[PDB]
Amino acid sequence: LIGAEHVNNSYECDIPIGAGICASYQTSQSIIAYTMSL
Amino acid sequence: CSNLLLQYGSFCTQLNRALTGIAVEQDKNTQEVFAQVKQIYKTPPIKDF
Ligand SMILES: *[C@@H]1O[C@H](CO)[C@@H](O)[C@H](O)[C@H]1NC(C)=O
């Protein structure tokens, strides 16, 4: 995945990517990738 | 082969959703069976039940 910055903190995700990682638009504001929160 | 696929690209095109539809279905299947509660409950440290 390119163009998305990975972040260690976990939130609830809306756009499934796979293998335990989603993506979301979170604060400017840019697109980020993170492990979802159960 | 690709120059002859423009007559069967549509057949190549519908099999993609038939594969995408099942792929998103199995992803939704796990959500419908395991994701019932939104709150994760930790087991108590006391094992005396
Ligand atoms: C997230 O926090 C952990 C805490 O140990 C740290 O090791 C890790 O490098 C952090 N990740 C990022 C992307 O800053």
Tab-separated table of C-alpha atoms and ligand atoms in Angstrom:
chain	number	residue	atom	x	y	z
A	1	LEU	CA	0.000	0.000	0.000
A	2	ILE	CA	1.432	3.353	-1.088
A	3	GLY	CA	0.209	6.865	-0.372
A	4	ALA	CA	-1.212	5.947	3.054
A	5	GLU	CA	0.684	6.499	6.305
A	6	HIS	CA	0.598	3.655	8.823
A	7	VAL	CA	-0.182	4.581	12.433
A	8	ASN	CA	0.233	2.429	15.536
A	9	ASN	CA	-2.992	3.460	17.284
A	10	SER	CA	-6.196	1.561	16.532
A	11	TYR	CA	-9.714	2.843	15.833
A	12	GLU	CA	-12.878	1.388	14.335
A	13	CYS	CA	-12.418	0.962	10.586
A	14	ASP	CA	-14.920	1.432	7.764
A	15	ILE	CA	-13.056	0.414	4.576
A	16	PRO	CA	-11.866	-3.231	4.746
A	17	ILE	CA	-8.501	-3.958	3.125
A	18	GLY	CA	-7.614	-7.383	4.531
A	19	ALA	CA	-5.230	-9.246	6.853
A	20	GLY	CA	-6.267	-7.304	9.937
A	21	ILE	CA	-5.670	-3.798	8.545
A	22	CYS	CA	-8.218	-1.231	7.320
A	23	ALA	CA	-7.926	2.330	6.025
A	24	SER	CA	-9.675	5.567	6.959
A	25	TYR	CA	-9.480	9.339	6.489
A	26	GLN	CA	-8.319	10.741	9.833
A	27	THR	CA	-6.468	13.899	10.887
A	28	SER	CA	-4.183	18.660	7.864
A	29	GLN	CA	-6.076	15.396	7.328
A	30	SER	CA	-4.774	12.524	5.205
A	31	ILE	CA	-5.574	8.883	4.499
A	32	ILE	CA	-4.135	6.509	7.108
A	33	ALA	CA	-3.903	2.742	7.552
A	34	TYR	CA	-4.170	0.922	10.870
A	35	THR	CA	-5.139	-2.331	12.528
A	36	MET	CA	-8.851	-2.171	13.288
A	37	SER	CA	-10.284	-2.196	16.801
A	38	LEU	CA	-12.551	-5.093	17.742
B	1	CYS	CA	-5.132	-13.720	-27.481
B	2	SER	CA	-6.001	-10.273	-26.101
B	3	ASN	CA	-7.073	-9.083	-29.562
B	4	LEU	CA	-9.584	-11.950	-29.527
B	5	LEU	CA	-10.721	-11.167	-25.964
B	6	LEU	CA	-12.734	-8.091	-26.987
B	7	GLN	CA	-15.462	-10.504	-28.133
B	8	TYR	CA	-15.332	-12.384	-24.799
B	9	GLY	CA	-14.241	-9.557	-22.487
B	10	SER	CA	-17.838	-9.261	-21.299
B	11	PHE	CA	-17.718	-12.933	-20.294
B	12	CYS	CA	-14.461	-12.053	-18.546
B	13	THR	CA	-16.268	-9.046	-17.063
B	14	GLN	CA	-19.197	-10.844	-15.392
B	15	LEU	CA	-17.026	-13.565	-13.843
B	16	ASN	CA	-15.238	-10.787	-11.956
B	17	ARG	CA	-18.318	-9.721	-9.968
B	18	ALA	CA	-19.259	-13.389	-9.580
B	19	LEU	CA	-15.821	-13.723	-7.999
B	20	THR	CA	-16.026	-10.314	-6.301
B	21	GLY	CA	-19.517	-11.077	-5.001
B	22	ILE	CA	-18.461	-14.341	-3.380
B	23	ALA	CA	-15.266	-12.705	-2.072
B	24	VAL	CA	-17.175	-9.907	-0.345
B	25	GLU	CA	-19.765	-12.464	0.794
B	26	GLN	CA	-17.273	-14.643	2.693
B	27	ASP	CA	-15.859	-11.480	4.252
B	28	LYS	CA	-19.399	-10.596	5.330
B	29	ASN	CA	-20.029	-14.162	6.548
B	30	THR	CA	-17.397	-13.875	9.288
B	31	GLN	CA	-18.870	-10.531	10.379
B	32	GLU	CA	-22.347	-12.057	10.711
B	33	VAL	CA	-21.167	-15.008	12.831
B	34	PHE	CA	-18.391	-13.667	15.052
B	35	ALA	CA	-19.099	-9.908	15.325
B	36	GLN	CA	-22.235	-9.907	17.461
B	37	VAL	CA	-21.042	-7.913	20.479
B	38	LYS	CA	-19.217	-4.630	19.968
B	39	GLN	CA	-17.701	-4.727	23.478
B	40	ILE	CA	-14.675	-6.959	24.073
B	41	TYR	CA	-14.930	-8.614	27.493
B	42	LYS	CA	-11.784	-9.567	29.401
B	43	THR	CA	-11.730	-12.779	31.410
B	44	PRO	CA	-11.621	-12.215	35.186
B	45	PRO	CA	-8.338	-13.023	36.962
B	46	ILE	CA	-10.270	-15.100	39.523
B	47	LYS	CA	-10.717	-18.665	38.256
B	48	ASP	CA	-12.850	-19.746	41.247
B	49	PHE	CA	-16.304	-20.097	39.675
C	1	LIG	C1	3.634	3.182	18.133
C	1	LIG	O1	3.965	3.105	19.530
C	1	LIG	C2	4.918	2.078	19.847
C	1	LIG	C3	5.078	2.081	21.350
C	1	LIG	O2	6.194	1.300	21.755
C	1	LIG	C4	6.228	2.340	19.107
C	1	LIG	O3	7.138	1.278	19.373
C	1	LIG	C5	5.974	2.444	17.609
C	1	LIG	O4	7.174	2.806	16.935
C	1	LIG	C6	4.895	3.486	17.320
C	1	LIG	N1	4.600	3.534	15.898
C	1	LIG	C7	4.742	4.639	15.158
C	1	LIG	C8	4.391	4.508	13.707
C	1	LIG	O5	5.135	5.697	15.639
